[PDB]
Design a protein around this ligand. Structure first.
Ligand SMILES: [Mg+2]
Ligand SMILES: [Mn+2]
Ligand SMILES: [Mn+2]
Length: 271
């Protein structure tokens, strides 16, 4: 009762190992849950190209992710997308909002990902994902997600202008120190839920973290969110931006922490 879809095509990647991090995450989920992922797109090396160049390059991959996710959303299973970059969600979030106009999108990310072509400082498409899905600029892959239905969770240190774009659109922001499970449940109310996770939301993991207050979200906070959302309300989950080389012990250790965070939701969907 889980559908696993895996992006392996470049979607504006500026990091070297996010396609590889996606592949390793999918492999861990295949082994734990007895699943076989549907792998979409062909890898291409990372580059520092402008969104206006990277976006057309990604069209084939984005269109294929859209069709796979659409079928899954219309079916009876939990839709799980393991995505190299948040930019894959320019294809999926318009489908979520059209199929489930009452869904709340929990966009869990250390960033706001709410830049527009006018406001981006770096030209990076991955900084423009949530604004594109919400129609502030035209990605060519649709929009229709109400900003009033989007909640940024874990975001912090947002550029002043971007923060005002978020505010004016009506996107709520729950910073890591407010992002308890109940705070998230309060934001969702009775709505069905789509969860999008960018792993740079997580506090850089240190061992003796008992005596300092973290700046990012802790894995335990992410797990508590997955424990809190009722399985009957969970539409789907996107896991994005694990930058870890294939065959590395780093990737091995990272996917074990990921599986621990997602287990309450994925175990329930499987059984
Ligand atoms: Mg479903
Ligand atoms: Mn992101
Ligand atoms: Mn981010």
């Amino acid at each position: 009762m889980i559908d696993l879809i895996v992006s392996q095509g470049r979607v504006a990647d500026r990091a070297a190992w996010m396609i590889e991090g996606a592949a390793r995450t999918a492999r861990a989920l295949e082994e734990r849950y007895g699943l076989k992922g549907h792998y979409v797109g062909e890898p291409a090396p990372h580059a520092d190209d402008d969104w206006s160049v990277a976006l057309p390059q990604a069209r084939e991959t984005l269109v294929a992710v859209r069709e796979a996710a659409t079928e899954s959303i219309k079916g009876d299973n939990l839709t799980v997308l393991v995505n190299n970059t948040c930019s894959v969600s320019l294809a999926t979030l318009p489908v979520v909002a059209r199929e489930h106009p009452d869904a709340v999108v929990l966009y869990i990310d250390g960033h706001g990902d709410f830049n527009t072509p006018e406001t981006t400082d770096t030209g990076y498409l991955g900084g423009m994902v949530l604004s594109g899905a919400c129609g502030l600029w035209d990605s060519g892959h649709g929009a229709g997600l109400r900003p009033e239905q989007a909640v940024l969770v874990g975001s912090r240190d947002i550029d002043e202008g971007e923060r005002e774009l978020i505010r004016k659109a009506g996107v709520r922001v729950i910073p890591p120190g407010e992002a308890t499970a109940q705070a998230v449940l309060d934001a969702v109310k009775d709505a069905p839920v789509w969860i999008h996770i960018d792993w740079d939301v997580l506090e850089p993991g240190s061992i003796p973290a008992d005596y300092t207050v973290p700046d990012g979200m802790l894995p335990a906070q992410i797990r508590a969110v997955f424990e809190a959302i009722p399985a009957e309300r969970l539409i789907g989950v996107e896991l994005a931006e694990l930058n870890a080389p294939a065959d590395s012990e780093r990737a091995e250790q990272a996917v074990a922490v990921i599986l621990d965070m997602v287990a309450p939701a994925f175990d329930a969907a499987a059984a």
